Amino acid sequence: SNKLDSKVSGNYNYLYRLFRKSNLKPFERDISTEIYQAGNKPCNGVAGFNCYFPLRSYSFRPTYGVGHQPYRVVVLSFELLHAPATVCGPKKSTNLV
Amino acid sequence: STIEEQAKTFLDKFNHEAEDLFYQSSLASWNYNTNITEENVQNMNNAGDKWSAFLKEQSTLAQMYPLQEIQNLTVKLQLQALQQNGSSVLSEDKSKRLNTILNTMSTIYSTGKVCNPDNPQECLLLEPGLNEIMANSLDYNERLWAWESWRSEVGKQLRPLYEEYVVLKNEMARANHYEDYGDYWRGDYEVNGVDGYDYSRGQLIEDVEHTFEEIKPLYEHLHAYVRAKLMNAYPSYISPIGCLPAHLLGDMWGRFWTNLYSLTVPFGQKPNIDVTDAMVDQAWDAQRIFKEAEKFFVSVGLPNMTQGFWENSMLTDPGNVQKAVCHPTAWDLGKGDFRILMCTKVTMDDFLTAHHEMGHIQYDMAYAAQPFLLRNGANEGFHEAVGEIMSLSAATPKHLKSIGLLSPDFQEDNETEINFLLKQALTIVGTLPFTYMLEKWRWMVFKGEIPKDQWMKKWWEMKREIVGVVEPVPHDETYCDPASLFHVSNDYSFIRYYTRTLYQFQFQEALCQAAKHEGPLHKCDISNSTEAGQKLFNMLRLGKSEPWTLALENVVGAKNMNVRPLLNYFEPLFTWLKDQNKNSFVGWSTDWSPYA
Ligand SMILES: [Zn+2]
Incomplete structure (x- = not known):
């Protein structure tokens, strides 16, 4: 979406997370914004001694290269359970004689 | 918890906001290098202000981070290049008057105007003056007068200023826990921690001096050739056993000898390789020559480049109201932003130079995946070298013949290739003399081995015996x-x-x-x-x-x-x-002087 999502002044809207204490299980949405505690001293909820905000903005600009421009990703996952399986898929038809 | 994880977190952050700040700073820079307007000056200034402020804050807070208990051999380089105590060790007032003294000396250099005698109106800034007089005239008296004026009106003003600045730099180097400021710059080549592959701060002295001694016969023969050409040109001003005049080497500092090429050419009947008229005949532009070099890089297997190169980098002189610099430079705006600046002109020198900065483009691209403080060469000398290797390799006539610049009927001759070799010797080999002279001279000056009162005199002995340059006019300690x-x-x-x-x-x-x-x-x-x-x-x-x-x-x-x-x-x-x-x-003698 380099044509659209890249604005000249900088699309400072969206966020990445880069520091986390541990990994995450598949398929859960975590919205924790607590300051990462890299050092042994407490963060006290503010940036400081080995303490930084885990979320930083994209800061996209049109000048960015192909490998840095925004990309929209959609993941479709199918789940089959003990249900009559409503969503099936299209069925064709032909003229009758 | 160990400190290595804290260091890794801090360096990752530092990379993040540092590359961000560098990105917008270089964006403003590429703005300015194509437009001259005051708010651009303002925002470059303040963006650099945040740059310096946050860099200083991070360096100061990381100064407390040690090096003994941090492994991986690569974070060590990050810490070494991030600590950077520098001149911040001394007091704030010391930094203040250091800043102002550097400002005054750089301004004195830039604002050094040479005014003709008996007419204090036609002063020359050396930008529109001697730069063409030296390359288009062969007047001994005018060159000598300009040389004396440049070394008298300028150096006498800041000789005590130069002494004070040298003393200050040596003092800050001593406070930096190095023996001298020469060792302070040698610290950039400091290598240790890996067995067999270490490198000391004295090994460079020994091997460079040994290599210079080995090369010395080549300079001796070159100096003999230049002297013989000088008697062939000026037999009444150069002794056959003495040293060459300072203002007859080709330039004021003895750096380039190319100005004498047209005077030292033995076979002037055969023109050198010049196919600018050829590309003019096909009406080739910057776009065409750049596509040519693009597929030339393709031929050696190197990959193509993305779109931002050609819909972001403008490759002409804007003229009209938009004022831009015509010094060709490749700018690394950071994080996939690579641009080139060059005013397009029809010249083989421009051709090789354009090859030069585009090779630099690939050079900087090579380390695009590294952490922020790692985006340079292992040393610094690799840079303009790797930039020029491909240009010099393509300078061979076979490459020009293959790509259509040179007609197939042009048979290669020994005379033209020997002329190219001599042009190289006057150009590239001629840089070494002044290079080692100035470099060894500063290493002995900053080591405290030269008395202050006998400084200028101490400048002359080796100058009369190593490079073989004798002063046309004697100089005392007043000159600098x-x-x-x-x-x-x-x-x-x-x-x-x-x-x-x-x-x-x-x-x-x-x-x-x-x-x-x-x-x-x-x-x-x-x-x-x-x-x-x-x-x-x-x-x-x-x-x-x-x-x-x-x-x-x-x-x-x-x-x-x-x-x-x-x-x-x-x-x-x-x-x-x-x-x-x-x-x-x-050979030559170190006792003869043109002024007797
Ligand atoms: Zn280069």
Whole structure:
């Protein structure tokens, strides 16, 4: 979406997370914004001694290269359970004689 | 918890916001280099202000971070390049008057105007004046007068200022826990921690001096040739046993001898290789020559480039109201933003230079995946070297003939190639004399081995015996020769150009035996050399995570610099110089002076 999502002044809207204490299980949405505690001293909820905000903005600009421009990703996952399986898929038809 | 994790977190952050800040700073820079407007000056200033402020804050807070208990051998480089105590050790007032004294000295250099006698109106800034007089006139009196005026009106003003600045730099170096400021710059080459591949701060002194001594006969024959040409031109002003005049070398500092090429050419009947009229005939522009060089890089297997190159970088002179610099430079705006600045003109020099900065583009691209403080070469001399290797390799007439610049009917001749070799000797070999002179001179000056009252006199002895340059007009301690140089007016290490000159020939030879070239080294091309292209990629893909000694061992297998390629590439030139000088005196005397 380099044509659209890249604005000249900088699309400072969206966020990445880069520091986390541990990994995450598949398929859960975590919205924790607590300051990462890299050092042994407490963060006290503010940036400081080995303490930084885990979320930083994209800061996209049109000048960015192909490998840095925004990309929209959609993941479709199918789940089959003990249900009559409503969503099936299209069925064709032909003229009758 | 251990400190290594804290260091990793901090360095990752530092990379993040540092690359961000550098991105917008370079965006403003590429704004300015194409438009001259005041708010652009303002926002460059304040963006650099945040740059410096946050860098200083991070460096100060990381100064407390030690080095003993941090492993991985690469974070160590990050810490070493991030600590950077520098001049911040001393008091704030000391930094203040250091800043103002550097401002005053740089302004004095820039605002050094030479006014003609008996008319204080037609003053010259050396930008519109002597720069063309030296290259288009051969007047002894005018050159001598301008030389004396430049070394008198300028150096006398800041000779005590130069002494004070040198004392201040040595004092801050001593407070930096180094023996002297020369060692302070030598610390950039400090390499340790890996067995066998270490490098000391005194090894460079020894091997450079030994290599200079080995090369010395080549300079002796070159100086004899130049002196013989000088008697052929001015037999009434140069002694056959004395030293050459200072203002007859080709330039004021003795750096370039190319200005005498048209005077020192033995075979002027045969023109050199110049196909600018050819490309004018096909009406080639910057776009066409750049596509030519693009597929030339393709031929060595190097990949194409993205769109931002050509819908972001503008490659002409804007003229009209938009004012831009015409000094061609490749700008690394950071994080996939690569641009080129050049005013397009029809010239072979512009052709080779354009090859030069686009090779630099690939150079900077090579280490695009490294952490922020690692986006440079293992050393600094690799830069303008790797930039120029491909241009010099393509300078061979075979490459020009293949791509249509040179007609197939043009048979290669020994005279033109010997003329090219002599042009090289006057251009590239001529940089070494002033290089080692100034460089060793500053190493002995900053070591405290030269008395203050006998400084200027101490400048002359080796100048009369090593480089063989005798002053047309005697100079006392009032004069200040180094103050006349621009490259020291901004306080940069001059070793860079010597490293480039000595590394380059080794590089093209390495490429040649990588390409299995057969025959003379001066008839070797890097076209269709994809294996050497990928090997060079492997060489440049490291960055600043390993010693440059390992890079030299990777390219050819040597942990110490080799001067054999320099001799093998000029064996024909050496033989021709010997043949030419076999009927002329060899050597010079250090006692003769033109002023008696
Ligand atoms: Zn270069």
